[PDB]
Structure formats: C-alpha cells, structure tokens
Amino acid sequence: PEMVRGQVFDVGPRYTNLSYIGEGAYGMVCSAYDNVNKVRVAIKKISPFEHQTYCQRTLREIKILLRFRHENIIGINDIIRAPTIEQMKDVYIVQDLMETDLYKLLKTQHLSNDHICYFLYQILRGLKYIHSANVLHRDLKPSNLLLNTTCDLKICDFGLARVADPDHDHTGFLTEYVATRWYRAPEIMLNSKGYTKSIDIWSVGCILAEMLSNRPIFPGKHYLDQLNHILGILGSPSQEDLNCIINLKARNYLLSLPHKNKVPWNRLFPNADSKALDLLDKMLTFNPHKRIEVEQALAHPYLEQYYDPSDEPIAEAPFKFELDDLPKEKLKELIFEETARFQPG
Numbered sequence: 001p002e003m004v005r006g007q008v009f010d011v012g013p014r015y016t017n018l019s020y021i022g023e024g025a026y027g028m029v030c031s032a033y034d035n036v037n038k039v040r041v042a043i044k045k046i047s048p049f050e051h052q053t054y055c056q057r058t059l060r061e062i063k064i065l066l067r068f069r070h071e072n073i074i075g076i077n078d079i080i081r082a083p084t085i086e087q088m089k090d091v092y093i094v095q096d097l098m099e100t101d102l103y104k105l106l107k108t109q110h111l112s113n114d115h116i117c118y119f120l121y122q123i124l125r126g127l128k129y130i131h132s133a134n135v136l137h138r139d140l141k142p143s144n145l146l147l148n149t150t151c152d153l154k155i156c157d158f159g160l161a162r163v164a165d166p167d168h169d170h171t172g173f174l175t176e177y178v179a180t181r182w183y184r185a186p187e188i189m190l191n192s193k194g195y196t197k198s199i200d201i202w203s204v205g206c207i208l209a210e211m212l213s214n215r216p217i218f219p220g221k222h223y224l225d226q227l228n229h230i231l232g233i234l235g236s237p238s239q240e241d242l243n244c245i246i247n248l249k250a251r252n253y254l255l256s257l258p259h260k261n262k263v264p265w266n267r268l269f270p271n272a273d274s275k276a277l278d279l280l281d282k283m284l285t286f287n288p289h290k291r292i293e294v295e296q297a298l299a300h301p302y303l304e305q306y307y308d309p310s311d312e313p314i315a316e317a318p319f320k321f322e323l324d325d326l327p328k329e330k331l332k333e334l335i336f337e338e339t340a341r342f343q344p345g
C-alpha cells in the first residue's frame, strides 16, 4: 500500500505510481498507472462505512453508474474492495482519467462561441440520458464536467445523484441543502428538496452563463445570499410564480423584498450569441414548471448544428423508484453485493 496525502490506497500491485487529484467529505481521487491496460486511470477511494448518509450516497453512486453507459458520462471500469465484508474498509472505483475539467479551463481560457456551443451540447446530451433513466445528477458544476485535449466532455461525480421523486419535492422555507451553493436553483431556498429534473436544468443554465463570461453568474456567499443574487438578475417573481409558493414563510419573505426589474441577458453578456441568451433565459426561469426540459434545450436553435435525436441515446433500464431508513451496517452489505461482479472469484 502507497500513501497519498495521508491515506492508504490499497489498490496495488495492479495500480501504481499514484498522484493526488482531489477529494470530498468521504473520498479521495488519484491518478494511477494501470499495469494491465497500460494507461493512467482515475481511482476514487471511498471511505463511507462510519456514516449512514455517506453509505447511502455510495450505494446510489455505484448502482447508478453501473447501469449507465454513455459517451458524455464517466463510467466505472473496475471496483476494488476486500473479498469479505469484515475486511472491507474502503471501496475503490476506477474510472477513465480525463485531462482537465471545465472549472480549470474557465479560470485560464477564453472559450470561443463554437466551444461554448459544443460543450453545452455535450452536457445536455449526457443529461438527456441521465434524466431518461429517471435519475437527477443534483451537483452539476464546472469541476464535475471533465474534458480531454480534443474537447470531449464527460459528466462525473454522481455522489448526490438520486432517482427523481417529484411527489416528495415539497419542503419548508430555508431547508438545508448539500449541493454546491452557486448552482442551486431558487426553489431550493424556498420550497424544494431538489427531487425533480428542473433542478439540473438550473445548474446547466448557471454553467452556460459562466461559459459566456468566465465568472459564476450567482456566487452567493452563504445560503440566503444565493437567492439574493438570483433575484438581482431575474428580478422580482411575478404574481403567478409567487402564487405557486404556497408556504407562507417563503411567500412572505419574497413579498418583503424591494421590487427588482429583470436584468436583460444582453446587458450582462454583450458579446454572447443571441440564440445562446434565448436558451440561457429558458434554463434560468424562476418557476421550475416553466423551466425548459433537457430534450427541448437540445432542440433549441442555438444547438441546431449538433441536434440529432437519433444520436442522443436514452437509458435502456431506467430506475423504477427506500434505502433512506437502512443502518450503516446493512448499506455496507448492499455495497458489498453491488460490487461483487468485479471480484476475481
């Protein structure tokens, strides 16, 4: 076992010469040389077994990604874990290594309008597949959009991904939320658990805006500041949209705010393609029921040079619907079972 930044990476001898990439609350990613396929790969060490929530998220991530196969989505190529539940302290997911991500690219590179268009196309093409499986990504952001030197784009990090559940989307005002703050749709702060597909379209909207200027459109500094930033650009919600917010705490907060008029997109993005801003507007709609869906976004005139629904595949086996109540110890068993197919035996 090699250390990487203090963590044992128990993946050798097949995977050697490890370099730290990044991490999260319960895992670390490294590049590693695969001594079999003779390529570098990405390896995520996941260490979730001391927390039910991280176990839930580990099982979803693995189960979702094992069902998916698509050019614009990062798959799982191998899973390393111990041969018995007793000896299993971590799980390692092996994935295609990509050169960079959109976060790093936007900090260093101006994107031509043709690159923005192609990137957005690829995002939406992968998202069409995800949504067609009845899955939500729920943490779409530039650092989760990987790229290689030929500008192929793949969506990664399904750690917050969930099967859609729109009948249980309602919650109260200021309900805590885990996904990355700057890409949260307004309704998260108002009345939404983020259990419908419209949550991901908002994030893609934010990504498109950020591609146009190299800067996050809504960099909220804290939870309610995120909504402040959204309403500064979109302006005050209409009576009709405000009437869809039935929770009094949320509604009366909105009614307490000074009036704001809509900032026209062509004012924030003077050099942008007019069709790009027309799609941007439709993705960054305040009311989630009125917000554009993934297949309509693909059909938008901005993407006319790429749109080809016959070459925009859907999932063969969508998710049909309960791991919420299960303890740490039973989810470990389910993770062990879910990963059994990759064992030598």
Ligand SMILES: COCCN1Cc2ccc(-c3nc(NC4CCOCC4)ncc3Cl)cc2C1=O
Residues within 6 Å of the ligand: 021, 022, 023, 024, 026, 027, 028, 029, 042, 044, 074, 095, 096, 097, 098, 099, 100, 101, 104, 146, 156, 157, 158, 159
């Ligand atoms: C612990 O997990 C948290 C959630 N995260 C974080 C993360 C980071 C990185 C990759 C990844 N990164 C690369 N290439 C790098 C891109 C940036 O620039 C250097 C190379 N290639 C394949 C993958 Cl899977 C995946 C994830 C992921 O799932």
